[PDB]
Amino acid sequence: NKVMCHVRRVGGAFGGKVLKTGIIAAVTAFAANKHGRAVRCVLERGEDML
Amino acid sequence: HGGIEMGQGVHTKMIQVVSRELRMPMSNVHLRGTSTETVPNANISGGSVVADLNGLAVKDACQTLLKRLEPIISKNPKGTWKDWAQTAFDESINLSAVG
Amino acid sequence: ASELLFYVNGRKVIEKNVDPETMLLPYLRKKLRLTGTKYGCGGGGCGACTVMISRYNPITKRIRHHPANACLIPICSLYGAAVTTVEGIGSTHTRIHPVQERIAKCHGTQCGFCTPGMVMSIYTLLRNHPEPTLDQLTDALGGNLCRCTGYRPIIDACKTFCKTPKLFAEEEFLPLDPTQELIFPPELMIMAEKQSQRTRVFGSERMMWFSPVTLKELLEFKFKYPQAPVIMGNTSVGPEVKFKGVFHPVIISPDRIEELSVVNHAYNGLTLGAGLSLAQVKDILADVVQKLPEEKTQMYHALLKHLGTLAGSQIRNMASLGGHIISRHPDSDLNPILAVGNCTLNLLSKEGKRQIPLNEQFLSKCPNADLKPQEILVSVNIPYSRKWEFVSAFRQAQRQENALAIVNSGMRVFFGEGDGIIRELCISYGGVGPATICAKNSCQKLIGRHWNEQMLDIACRLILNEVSLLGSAPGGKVEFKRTLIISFLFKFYLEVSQILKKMDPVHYPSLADKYESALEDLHSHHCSTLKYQNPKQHPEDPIGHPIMHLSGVKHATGEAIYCDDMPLVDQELFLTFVTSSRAHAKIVSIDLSEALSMPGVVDIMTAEHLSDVNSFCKFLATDKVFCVGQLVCAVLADSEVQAKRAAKRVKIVYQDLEPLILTIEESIQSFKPERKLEYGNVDEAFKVVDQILEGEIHMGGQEHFYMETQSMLVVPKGEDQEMDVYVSTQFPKYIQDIVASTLKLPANKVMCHVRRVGGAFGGKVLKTGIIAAVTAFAANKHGRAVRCVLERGEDMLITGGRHPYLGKYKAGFMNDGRILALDMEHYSNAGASLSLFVIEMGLLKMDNAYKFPNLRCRGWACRTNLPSNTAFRGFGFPQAALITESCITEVAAKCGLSPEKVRIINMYKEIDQTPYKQEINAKNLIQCWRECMAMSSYSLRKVAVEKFNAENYWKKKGLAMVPLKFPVGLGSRAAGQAAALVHIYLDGSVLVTHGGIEMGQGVHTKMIQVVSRELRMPMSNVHLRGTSTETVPNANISGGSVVADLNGLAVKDACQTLLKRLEPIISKNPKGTWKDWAQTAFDESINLSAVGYFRGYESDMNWEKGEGQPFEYFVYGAACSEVEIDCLTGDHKNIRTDIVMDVGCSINPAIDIGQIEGAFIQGMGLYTIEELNYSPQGILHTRGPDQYKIPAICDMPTELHIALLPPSQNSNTLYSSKGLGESGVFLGCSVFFAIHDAVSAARQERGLHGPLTLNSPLTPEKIRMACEDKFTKMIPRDEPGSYVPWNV
Amino acid sequence: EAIYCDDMPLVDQELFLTFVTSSRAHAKIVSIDLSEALSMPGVVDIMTAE
Ligand SMILES: Cc1cc2nc3c(=O)[nH]c(=O)nc-3n(C[C@H](O)[C@H](O)[C@H](O)COP(=O)(O)OP(=O)(O)OC[C@H]3O[C@@H](n4cnc5c(N)ncnc54)[C@H](O)[C@@H]3O)c2cc1C
Ligand SMILES: Nc1nc2c(c(=O)[nH]1)N[C@H]1C(S)=C(S)[C@@H](COP(=O)(O)O)O[C@H]1N2
Ligand SMILES: Nc1nc2c(c(=O)[nH]1)N[C@H]1C(S)=C(S)[C@@H](COP(=O)(O)O)O[C@H]1N2
Ligand code: MOS
Ligand code: MOS
Ligand code: FES
Ligand code: FES
């Protein structure tokens, strides 16, 4: 009840925006909470494929 | 609803459902997005069934809403949705429904 | 060149090329993102922006901590210092500080907006006095205002720091560890330990700021820039640049120069540094007074007296002595005392040392006695008093402290060894003209005379024409000021003709026995007790338990986000309004050309630019204005500063129109709809009565004075014209409507979101929506988020207040006081626009506790050229019920019976009928009256007050008791409908929301208590985020005393639905967690989301027949109040108040007792000290003694007892609870009628029978002028139409 | 005009997160040196599994 997830749209997914997305969100949210700051994580194509 | 728009047009289909079920133009319906705050415990948007299943849940809410209003609709069949909504409020009929 | 370096909450802050005009409050909030420190009023009055300032003294090796109001601190003054905000002392993500823990857990926060200020005042004092006395703590909070709590719970929190069935566990509060406090930043010690002589320079395009750090340099800068102000505390210069259009290109702001902070104990007296704070002067003189004998400490006593009341703790710690003297404010409390005391000023220039006397010419700013432009005040000499020299100072304001004087004085006499021939005499007054004036000519004529009443009568005459006021004098109150002038003269006569008696008993006469009480004045302690109920119920069920407000700690730590605390959204603009300055005028033209060209300005909208969307069901004035404060233009800019700058350059030319209607009587000269109730047959009843009586009472309005001003942020999404509206409002659905309408959009495109409101009391609805509509129009037009936050001055002008009322009555009664006939007329003042609903509720609730067998009741709303008034906590009842109590106490007078005998025999019986034919069980009305008579010990205290008044001529006491029937219910069933939405997530945790708004009344706390009971889970497992049209649609307004009742029923409804679905799962695994039940429900395809709905209480009123069932239930109560008045000054003191209250079964007695106290104090203010002064042109006065004053700690009754009548079941309402909230406001008039009683006792003894009608608010002016004496007869008076008055 | 996740405006004082990823397919992590990385402009924090 403390954490809400909001999604307007996704620019394609085809199954590849689930487990690994969540890991990155978890790590990102840990940082955000630790420093009391909004944190943004966007991957470049090379990193993304890897 | 719990479904996610990834480009497959799930949101377009749900408004088509709403438009049929409440008998109103698609221009009268709006959707903003998807949120755990509004619809809890939703399954993954996958398995070729996002529209199928969320369509059935949207239809379910619409029908519930139409059942509540049928007394008001029969008593004023040529009235707008604005009139039906207003008299429903004036008669203490709830205009929010989970599907 | 220079860099600004200071600390905030332990962290270093560096600003390079800093703008000198930056004030600390916006800097903290915007640049550092510390939003705990709030804006309340921006003049230093309220204390919402209170912070701690710390400095290391490098010579004395000591760290000094003082409180201050951040709104008035320019950041360039903070160089080398350490600021501490509320966030600095603790948080929920570190450790909470005990001050924060206790103010919250003692229920000392309601809306919470004042909490950070309260916390920082208490923190700062505990840092200086770790083991304090309550006196010191309540003195620290003299500067801190609160509109919700009534101060009692904040006082209780303070007591827990003093080594001297409850609502909180004191024993569980963790102790104040004085050694684990915040360390003063070491770098600032190291900087201080190396006295830089280099003078600091900060520049911008508009302003130069020099901080000289040596005396040499200060005089160097005072020569170059002779006309630059020397800023010390900025509590004189600051407030006048804010709202008197003053501007200084050059500022000089010296650091601690040692010669400016001298404390010399001379042989002849003492010399005090001009840079000492007023707080430090109060301490120096307190010590001197105790260390020296009491005829050399005569001046120092009079200064201490007036420093005790001067402003509050924050301003005293900021304001300097030199600043005070040089400011030369006409209402200055210290200058008239210094004037009379042979005080001299030590001036210093680049050319040399020089000494001038502090006399009338100096206070008049005659350049011969003034400082020359190139010199500065170093120190002032206050000499010791000689033997047979006596000094006295008096003052009268609107309340006892943190309020500017209407009139004050300093007076001195010298006799010189023995015989009572007066050899010197100085009499100085303030508030009686543009400067502090000394009656020197009168004083010359009195030299040689003896001290007795022969000289008083002549002295009074010959001052009353020397120190005269024109009837049109600014400040108003001319006949009151006239009286105070001679009344203070009388008090001085008495006072000093007693030290003479003391010192020389045989040669001087003793005072008359009924006169002594004139000398000692009225100065409090704050005691209270609270009775309520508390076996068969489960220990995990929270219903009935005094649960702390869910945000209570977040209030205390400043982590609660209010609308303006939301972060800056990318590229947001600010909107500010140009408002009408005329009451009824043609708008001939608007020139925007200068405004439009100025820095940052994006757009300026008039009514033309809104075209066909300038109204709803009009926003901006078109071609006429119908009151001052009406919206005219809207200025949109890149920043708030730029917006207000540009707004002040918009030129509007007007042409006044007739008639200019201001009063209710003027407004009675087309067609008004009437409202009427008739019971029995009043025309027949008038034939068979013993007596008939006509009368009337005017009643003033009331500003809402929510501590959070009007605030909103409108954010366009950028898709489909979607708007999100974050606004401090009581009615989101209405915001959604007016914004959507304005944008020509469907309602599904606009969503309104509200987390919390910092108080509202009805004043955050219609006018809020207009501003939101205009704001959203701009946002949409420019594709930008737009923020609109109002300053206090604009807010009071643009928003309305409570409706002022006129009551006329004809009462036919028996000689036993029973009222068989009653004809009644109500008139509300509506302002520019319609208000009829307020008349309707007035008439329905008019009866209050009494059965009028034959009754005609009629009302009319009256449009005037004043701001449009709105609904308020009470909704016509505080006005309507005051009319009927006035009518009672008049009938009581004509029967020779106490009003309380007349009340008790006109009351409803156990079973009885209302004027609108609703049946009532008034059993609890009787009990409330019985218990209040018992609890208060009314009968014994009645003779105590009669006894007192027989022995005291210049001080009277009074006592009164009033009953309460407050009916509750709305017009229709549909108005009472309510909805909620409940989710259970698969971990078992719950999210709930509903249509109700949290304004500080604790509605959200109560809903979680409901959820906790209904789903049988701890409150820690439930969460609520806020209120939104996106989650719960079509919700009604949060008002009518029923927000919790109705949304509670809807929350319960969702919970029960959810529990029904789960009962199969629960029976099959009864010892399972909610996580298990939720998970298996998901696994079995059972839905864990439910809408809850309550249809509304059945309700109706046929206004044609005058009959119906409008009300679902009635809150019953009674209240007793005792006061003592000063008949010479019109001052008063609330001694004691006793309140008994039928609440049914309280869902939360902490919250419900909080609402009783809050409502009571709000009503107390309405009826005594709250007063709005309008000019004959309809301009609101907002400056000097015309300042609007809500109740402070000094107004809270010395004793306060509150009982909750034992419950008795209401199957119809939520857990048999009664929605109080509005109820306690009317109980404030117990104070009104207690004062009314006291005035009558002075009028009976002196022999002035016949018509005594005192109007509300019962101000000190009204009290004094009612206590007629030789001084009231003596004053010179003016012809009605000969002059134009400052007010009325 | 369609807003995707990264199109959302900069929220006040937001930080950015980026990952260091493995360059070996199956290897022991003998050590991680963050001292140079931690000293560089703008860096707020570097989190490892510890
Ligand atoms: C909320 C509030 C409540 C108040 N209540 C009261 C009250 O109850 N009773 C009362 O009597 N007063 C009251 N005041 C007035 C207050 O006492 C004065 O504003 C204050 O004493 C001025 O001191 P300062 O250091 O702030 O002056 P500043 O504003 O710093 O300076 C004001 C003027 O003094 C000049 N000045 C200062 N020091 C020197 C010097 N050494 N040499 C030459 N010129 C100098 C400046 O150039 C400037 O023109 C109140 C003010 C506020 C804001
Ligand atoms: N444009 C677009 N089409 C798409 C996807 C997507 O990410 N983008 N995902 C596919 C996958 S993997 C699934 S499971 C389905 C899910 O949506 P549906 O059940 O409504 O077809 O959409 C398919 N079509
Ligand atoms: N602290 C606080 N208490 C308050 C208010 C407020 O704005 N702040 N408003 C009052 C008014 S005018 C009303 S109508 C009720 C509404 O809430 P309730 O019905 O839950 O009592 O709260 C009252 N108590
Ligand atoms: O079920 Mo699609 O995300 S493989
Ligand atoms: O019903 Mo309260 O907002 S007067
Ligand atoms: S005291 Fe600074 S906000 Fe009112
Ligand atoms: S809680 Fe103090 S102002 Fe509302």
UniProtKB/Swiss-Prot annotation, chain B:
It is found in: Cytoplasm. The modification Phosphoserine is found at residue 27. Abundant in liver, expressed in adipose tissue and at lower levels in lung, skeletal muscle, pancreas. In contrast to mice, no significant gender difference in AOX1 expression level (at protein level). Disulfide bonds: none annotated. Coiled coil: none annotated. Induction: In liver, is down-regulated by adiponectin and by the PPARA agonist, fenofibric acid. Mo-molybdopterin binds at residues 6, 47-50. Belongs to the xanthine dehydrogenase family. Homodimer. Oxidase with broad substrate specificity, oxidizing aromatic azaheterocycles, such as N1-methylnicotinamide, N-methylphthalazinium and phthalazine, as well as aldehydes, such as benzaldehyde, retinal, pyridoxal, and vanillin. Plays a key role in the metabolism of xenobiotics and drugs containing aromatic azaheterocyclic substituents. Participates in the bioactivation of prodrugs such as famciclovir, catalyzing the oxidation step from 6-deoxypenciclovir to penciclovir, which is a potent antiviral agent. Is probably involved in the regulation of reactive oxygen species homeostasis. AOX genes evolved from a xanthine oxidoreductase ancestral precursor via a series of gene duplication and suppression/deletion events. Different animal species contain a different complement of AOX genes encoding an equivalent number of AOX isoenzymes. In mammals, the two extremes are represented by certain rodents such as mice and rats, which are endowed with 4 AOX genes, and by humans, whose genome is characterized by a single active gene. This is Aldehyde oxidase. It comes from Homo sapiens (Human). The chain holds residues 1042 to 1140 of 1338 of the full protein.
UniProtKB/Swiss-Prot annotation, chain C:
Keywords: 2Fe-2S, Cytoplasm, FAD, Flavoprotein, Iron, Iron-sulfur, Lipid metabolism, Metal-binding, Molybdenum, Oxidoreductase, Phosphoprotein. Its EC number is 1.2.3.1, 1.17.3.-. This is Aldehyde oxidase. It is found in: Cytoplasm. The modification Phosphoserine is found at residue 1020. Binds 2 [2Fe-2S] clusters per subunit. Mo-molybdopterin binds at residues 110, 148, 760-761, 999, 1040-1043, 1155, 1220. [2Fe-2S] cluster 2 binds at residues 111, 114, 146, 148. Changing residue 1087 to S: Increases homodimerization and turnover number with phenanthridine as substrate; nearly no effect on kinetic parameters with benzaldehyde, phtalazine and chloroquinazolinone as substrate. Induction: In liver, is down-regulated by adiponectin and by the PPARA agonist, fenofibric acid. It catalyses: an aldehyde + O2 + H2O = a carboxylate + H2O2 + H(+); retinal + O2 + H2O = retinoate + H2O2 + H(+). Disulfide bonds: none annotated. It is an enzyme of class 1 (oxidoreductase). Its main location: cytoplasm. The active site is at residue 1222. FAD binds at residues 230-237, 311, 320, 324, 333, 377. Transmembrane segments: none annotated.
